Amino acid sequence: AVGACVLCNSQTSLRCGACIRRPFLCCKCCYDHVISTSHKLVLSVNPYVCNAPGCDVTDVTQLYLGGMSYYCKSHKPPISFPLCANGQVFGLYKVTDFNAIATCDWTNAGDYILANTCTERLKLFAAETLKATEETFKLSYGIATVREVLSDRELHLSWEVGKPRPPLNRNYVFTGYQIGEYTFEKDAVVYRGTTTYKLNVGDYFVLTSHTVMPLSAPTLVPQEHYVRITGLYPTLNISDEFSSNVANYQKVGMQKYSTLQGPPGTGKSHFAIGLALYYPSARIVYTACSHAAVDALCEKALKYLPIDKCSRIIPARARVECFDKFKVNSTLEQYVFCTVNALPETTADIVVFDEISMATNYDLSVVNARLRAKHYVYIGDPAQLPAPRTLLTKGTLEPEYFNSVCRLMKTIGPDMFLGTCRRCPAEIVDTVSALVYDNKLKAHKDKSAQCFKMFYKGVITHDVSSAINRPQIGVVREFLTRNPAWRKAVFISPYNSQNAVASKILGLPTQTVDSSQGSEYDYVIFTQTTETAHSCNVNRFNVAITRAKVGILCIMSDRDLYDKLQFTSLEI
Ligand SMILES: [Zn+2]
Ligand SMILES: [Zn+2]
Ligand SMILES: [Zn+2]
C-alpha cells in the first residue's frame, strides 16, 4: 500500500483505482490525474469512499476527511477538510501525457507515438497498460468447439454466437481443452496442433490470455561512454572474415549499449557471432522475441563458435520446434541462445538483442530486468517489420515509434550501419536503398537480370478481411510455364488467404511478408494482392523484395511502388 509515484517517484499511500495497472500517484500528481480525467477513484490502505453507511460516493473530488475517516458533501462533519485542495489529494508524505496513456484504448497510432516519446517511467506504465489492454481484449472473442474431424490436418469448427471470431491466421494461437496450443488456416479449415493429439469432437479452444507482470527495469539503461574497452578482452588474432567489424566491436566495448542498423543481408548474424570471436572470454546471451530469430543466431554460432559452450534455452511449455544441435537449458554455458519470454535471471559481459524492429517496449524492459550485463547490443533495422499491434486500427505506426531502440536509430542515427547488401541482385538493392535507406545501402552483387515487375490489379476477393487476387495468381501460373527455373520459387504475399490459394494453384511453398522476415530464397514471386495501407507499407515492401538472392517477380497493384521497382517490366 506504500510505493513510489510513477511520474515523480515521490513516496505515497495513493494508487489510482480507475487505471487498469493501479499506479502509485503522489498527492501533487494524483490531483492532476483525477481533476483532468474520468478517473476519480483513489486507493489507499482503505479506498477514498464515503464511510457513511449505504453511501455510494467514490469520486475523490466530492469527498472530505472527518477526523481520520472519509465522507461526501452530504455526510461530512462540520470540521472536515476536502481531499482535493491546492493541487493535491490528501495522503501520506504530502502528467498531461500520463492522463492520455491511462485513459486511451490503444486503437490510435497517436497512443503508440506517446508511449514512445514520454519519459522512461511513463514508457513502462504505457507498456504495462497496453499489454494488459491487449490481454483483456482476447476475452472479447468467441470460443470455437470442434463439430467434425475430417483428417489429421483438417476439421470443421462451430463458433460462439454474440462474440466476434478472431482472425484465423498463424498470429492467433489458441489453447486446446490443456491439450497443447493450436492454430488454423482456411467449410474446410486446416488445424496445426503443437502436440499431436487425436482431435476430439466437442473439445473447445480459447485464446492464451496471459497475466501481464509489472515492469521495473527501463527500456534502455542510461547510456555510459568509456575511454577504453571496459570489462571485455579483445584478440589481435581475429580471423579476416570479421576484420570489417573490428572498429564497431571496439565501439561496442567503449559504451554501455550500442545500436546496429543492418539492412537485409548486410551481415547482422555475422556481426553478432563475430563479437564472440573478438571478445573470446566474454559470456554472451543471444536473445530475440521469436524462436526463428534465436534459431538463426544458433545456426551462425554452430559454424563459428565451439558447440560445447553453446546452450539453447527452451521453455518447459515447449510451443514450436526449434534449434536441436546445442545442449538444452544449460543457463551456465558461455553462449546462451534464448527468446525474451524464456530468459533466465542471469548476468553477461555482452547481451545481443537481435531483430530489434520486432521488440515492444515491454520486451526491452523484460530483457533489462532478467539480464545484468556490462554491454547491451541492439541489432536490427527500423526499415523492417514491427511487432503486430492487435489493438491499433487507426493511423500507421512509423518506425521511430516501434520501440525506444528504433526511436534512437530514426532520430540520432544508429551507432553502427552495415552499408553493403551481399544477398540481393543490384536491382533490389538500388530499389530499397532509395525507398527506405536514403541511398546509403550499396549492392555487392551485380544486377541478376532476373528481377521482373508486372502492373496487374486483377480482382480482389476477401476471406472475411484477408485478401485474395486469383487473376494475380493466374498471371504467375502463365509466367511459370514460360520460366521453369522459377519452379523452385517461394510465393510471398501480404495475405495468408492469397497464400492458401497460391499454394493449391501453383504448389510453390508459401510465405507472408511478415513470416518471410530474416529468411532468404533464390527466387521470390510476390503478388501485392491489394492496394491497401497494409500491402503498400514501405517496410513490408522492403522486406518482401529483399528476400531474393537471384530473382524476383513482383505482380503489383500500386502504381507508386511499381514505378519505383528498378526491374525489367513484363507484358500481359
Ligand atoms: Zn508524483
Ligand atoms: Zn487513473
Ligand atoms: Zn456520503
CA of 66 to the centre of ligand 2 (A): 25
Note the ligand closest to the C-alpha atom of 35. Answer: 2
3 labelled binding-site residue: no
Distance CA 350, CA 344 (A): 15
424 labelled binding-site residue: no
Note the ligand closest to the C-alpha atom of 24. Answer: 1
Note the ligand closest to the C-alpha atom of 103. Answer: 2
Under a CB-based contact definition with an 8 Å cutoff, are residues 342 and 315 in contact?
A: yes
Note the ligand closest to the C-alpha atom of 102. Answer: 2
Distance CA 499, CA 510 (A): 6
Number of neighbours of residue 297 by Cβ within 10 angstroms = 25
330 labelled binding-site residue: no
3-state DSSP of 136-157: HHHCCCCCEEEEEECCCCCEEE
CA of 370 to the centre of ligand 1 (A): 27
269 labelled binding-site residue: yes
Phi, psi of 357 (to 5 degrees): -65, -30
Bin 9: left if φ > 0, else alpha if -120 < ψ < 50, else beta. left
Note the ligand closest to the C-alpha atom of 91. Answer: 1
- Closest alpha carbon to 206 in 175, 167, 183, 160: 175
Angle CA(106)–CA(108)–CA(113) in degrees, nearest 5? 85
CA atoms within 13 Å, Cβ hemisphere of 128: 21
Note the ligand closest to the C-alpha atom of 29. Answer: 1
Angle CA(218)–CA(219)–CA(224) in degrees, nearest 5? 75
CA of 77 to the centre of ligand 3 (A): 11
Q: Are strands 327-328 and 310-312 parallel, antiparallel or unpaired?
A: parallel
CA of 58 to the centre of ligand 2 (A): 14
29 labelled binding-site residue: yes
Under a CB-based contact definition with an 8 Å cutoff, are residues 429 and 421 in contact?
A: yes
266 labelled binding-site residue: yes
Distance CA 228, CA 230 (A): 6
Under a CB-based contact definition with an 8 Å cutoff, are residues 41 and 16 in contact?
A: yes
Residues constituting the chain: 572
Identify the H or E element spanning 393: none
Distance CA 525, CA 527 (A): 7
Note the ligand closest to the C-alpha atom of 18. Answer: 2
Cα 267 to Cα 157, 194, 384, 416: the distances in Å are 45, 33, 15, 12
Note the ligand closest to the C-alpha atom of 6. Answer: 1
Distance CA 175, CA 152 (A): 18
| 263: three-class secondary structure by DSSP | coil
| 125: three-class secondary structure by DSSP | helix
Experimental method, per PDB record:
X-ray
Bin 86: left if φ > 0, else alpha if -120 < ψ < 50, else beta. left
**DSSP string of 273-286, one letter each residue:** HHHHHHSTT--EEE
Distance CA 438, CA 243 (A): 26
C-alpha cell at 8: 515523480
535 labelled binding-site residue: no
C-alpha cell at 51: 464511510
CA of 27 to the centre of ligand 1 (A): 7
CA of 66 to the centre of ligand 3 (A): 11
Distance CA 148, CA 157 (A): 7
Note the ligand closest to the C-alpha atom of 51. Answer: 3
In terms of DSSP H, where are the helices of 423-570?
A: 426-436, 470-482, 496-506, 513-516, 533-536, 538-545, 559-564
421 labelled binding-site residue: no
Phi, psi of 365 (to 5 degrees): -65, -50
| Exposure b/e, 380-401, CB count within 10 A at least 16 = b | bbbbbbbbebbbbeeeebbbbb
Under a CB-based contact definition with an 8 Å cutoff, are residues 521 and 503 in contact?
A: no
Under a CB-based contact definition with an 8 Å cutoff, are residues 106 and 51 in contact?
A: no
Identify the H or E element spanning 269: helix 268-278
Angle CA(48)–CA(52)–CA(54) in degrees, nearest 5? 100
CA atoms within 13 Å, Cβ hemisphere of 24: 17
Under a CB-based contact definition with an 8 Å cutoff, are residues 125 and 23 in contact?
A: yes
Amino acid occupying residue 62: Q
- Closest alpha carbon to 42 in 25, 65, 21, 67: 25
| 122: three-class secondary structure by DSSP | helix
C-alpha cell at 287: 536473445
Distance CA 479, CA 476 (A): 5
| 131: three-class secondary structure by DSSP | helix
Q: What's the reported resolution, in angstroms, to a tenth?
A: 2.2
| Exposure b/e, 89-110, CB count within 10 A at least 16 = b | bbbeeebebbbbbbebebeebe
Distance CA 285, CA 373 (A): 9
CA of 460 to the centre of ligand 2 (A): 45
Q: Which residues pair with 64 in a beta bridge?
A: 71, 82
Identify the H or E element spanning 318: none
Q: Which residues pair with 453 in a beta bridge?
A: 554, 569
Distance CA 291, CA 341 (A): 10
CA of 32 to the centre of ligand 1 (A): 10
Q: Are strands 371-380 and 346-353 parallel, antiparallel or unpaired?
A: parallel
CA of 18 to the centre of ligand 3 (A): 20
Under a CB-based contact definition with an 8 Å cutoff, are residues 287 and 254 in contact?
A: no
Phi, psi of 411 (to 5 degrees): -105, -70
C-alpha cell at 232: 571485455
Under a CB-based contact definition with an 8 Å cutoff, are residues 371 and 530 in contact?
A: no
Note the ligand closest to the C-alpha atom of 98. Answer: 2
Number of neighbours of residue 260 by Cβ within 10 angstroms = 28
243 labelled binding-site residue: no
CA of 551 to the centre of ligand 3 (A): 75
Parent domain of 505: 426-564
Under a CB-based contact definition with an 8 Å cutoff, are residues 383 and 436 in contact?
A: yes
Note the ligand closest to the C-alpha atom of 33. Answer: 2
291 labelled binding-site residue: no
Cα 322 to Cα 291, 297, 328, 370: the distances in Å are 6, 12, 11, 22
265 labelled binding-site residue: yes
16 labelled binding-site residue: yes
Note the ligand closest to the C-alpha atom of 89. Answer: 1
451 labelled binding-site residue: no
CA of 89 to the centre of ligand 2 (A): 13
Distance CA 218, CA 438 (A): 31
Q: Which residues pair with 156 in a beta bridge?
A: 148
CATH number at residue 462: 3.40.50.300
Place of cell 526511436: 407
Burial of 489 (0-12, 13-18, 19+ CB in 10 A): buried
CA of 234 to the centre of ligand 1 (A): 45
CA of 49 to the centre of ligand 3 (A): 8
CA of 32 to the centre of ligand 3 (A): 23
Place of cell 517511467: 121
Under a CB-based contact definition with an 8 Å cutoff, are residues 572 and 555 in contact?
A: no
Q: How do the residues of the chain divide into helix, strand and coil, expressed in percent and rounded to 5?
A: 30, 25, 45
CA of 42 to the centre of ligand 2 (A): 8
For CA atoms 514, 516, 517, 523, give the dihedral sign.
negative
CA of 31 to the centre of ligand 1 (A): 10
Under a CB-based contact definition with an 8 Å cutoff, are residues 30 and 42 in contact?
A: yes
CA of 101 to the centre of ligand 2 (A): 9
For CA atoms 395, 357, 136, 182, give the dihedral sign.
positive
Under a CB-based contact definition with an 8 Å cutoff, are residues 460 and 497 in contact?
A: no
Cα 540 to Cα 247, 261, 492, 535, 544: the distances in Å are 32, 17, 11, 7, 6
Nearby residues for ligand 3 (ion, Cβ within 5 Å): 50, 52, 55, 57, 72, 74-75
440 labelled binding-site residue: no
| Exposure b/e, 33-51, CB count within 10 A at least 16 = b | bbeebebbbbbbeeebbbe
Under a CB-based contact definition with an 8 Å cutoff, are residues 192 and 184 in contact?
A: yes
